[PDB]
Design a protein around this ligand. Structure first.
Ligand code: CA
Length: 89
């Protein structure tokens, strides 16, 4: 069980989700299922307001990838912020 998503969702603002939704929809303009690419995560961060590394972002991807299919949905896109709570150390 995880209670960080509830404690983190309350921290995030509507503006953050607004940007996240737009940052997602832009890529999901003609998606097959309705998600982005795990490798494209480094691209959305640059547009949102972040500049990580290929090894750093990689850990974030697999971490937020609840299904582990290959594409990043909105559920996996939003968790990126709340997942910070779970350090796993
Ligand atoms: Ca996925």
């Amino acid at each position: 069980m995880n209670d960080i998503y509830k404690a983190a969702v309350e921290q995030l603002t509507d503006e953050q989700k607004n940007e996240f939704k737009a940052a997602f929809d832009i890529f999901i303009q003609d998606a097959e299922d309705g998600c982005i690419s795990t490798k494209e995560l480094g691209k959305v961060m640059r547009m949102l307001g972040q500049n990580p590394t290929p090894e750093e972002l990689q850990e974030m991807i697999d971490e937020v990838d609840e299904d582990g299919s290959g594409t990043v949905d909105f559920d996996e896109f939003l968790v990126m912020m709340v997942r910070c709570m779970k350090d796993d150390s």
